[PDB]
């Protein structure tokens, strides 16, 4: 149907906007701490601690499959990256501190993304 096509164009355009958001958030992680999944070879107990692992490469795979229907879904995955790290790692670690700085810096990007998503529809 033509309606299905229009819906698909909306999804494609959301995917465009979320790709730009993802790039901007990942720039706030210049150490690349959150770039890839925590390795279960190197942290064998990780899934005993963290039930839903997340990282920027995993988000990018979902994004490119147009697997985010709305900004809320995308934000959920970004918050997992931060929240998982702040639980597994102690306050005094470079990992925890990186997550705090990512959260704080990412807030700005996400605040305007929300206005753009609502604005453009």
Swiss-Prot record:
Highly expressed in testis. It is found in: Nucleus; Chromosome. There is a cross-link at residue 41 (Glycyl lysine isopeptide (Lys-Gly) (interchain with G-Cter in SUMO2)). It comes from the Eukaryota. Residues 9-113 form the Bromo domain. Coiled coil: none annotated. Scaffold subunit of various histone acetyltransferase (HAT) complexes, such as the MOZ/MORF and HBO1 complexes, that acts as a regulator of hematopoiesis. Plays a key role in HBO1 complex by directing KAT7/HBO1 specificity towards histone H3 'Lys-14' acetylation (H3K14ac), thereby promoting erythroid differentiation. Component of some HBO1 complex composed of KAT7/HBO1, MEAF6, ING4 and BRD1/BRPF2. Component of the MOZ/MORF complex composed at least of ING5, KAT6A, KAT6B, MEAF6 and one of BRPF1, BRD1/BRPF2 and BRPF3. Interacts (via PHD-type zinc finger domain) with unmodified histone H3. Interacts (via PWWP domain) with dimethylated and trimethylated 'Lys-79' on histone H3. This is Bromodomain-containing protein 1. It comes from Homo sapiens (Human). The lineage of its organism: Eukaryota, Metazoa, Chordata, Craniata, Vertebrata. The chain holds residues 555 to 674 of 1058 of the full protein.
């Amino acid at each position: 149907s033509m309606e299905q096509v229009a819906m698909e164009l909306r999804l494609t355009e959301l995917t465009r906007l979320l790709r730009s958001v993802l790039d901007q958030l990942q720039d706030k992680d210049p150490a690349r701490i959150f770039a890839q999944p925590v390795s279960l070879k190197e942290v064998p107990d990780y899934l005993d601690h963290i039930k839903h692992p997340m990282d920027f490469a995993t988000m990018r795979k979902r994004l490119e499959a147009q697997g985010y229907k709305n900004l809320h879904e995308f934000e959920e995955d970004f918050d997992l990256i931060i929240d998982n790290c702040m639980k597994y790692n102690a306050r005094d670690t470079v990992f925890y501190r990186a997550a705090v700085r990512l959260r704080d810096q990412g807030g700005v990007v996400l605040r305007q993304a929300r206005r753009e998503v609502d604005s453009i529809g």
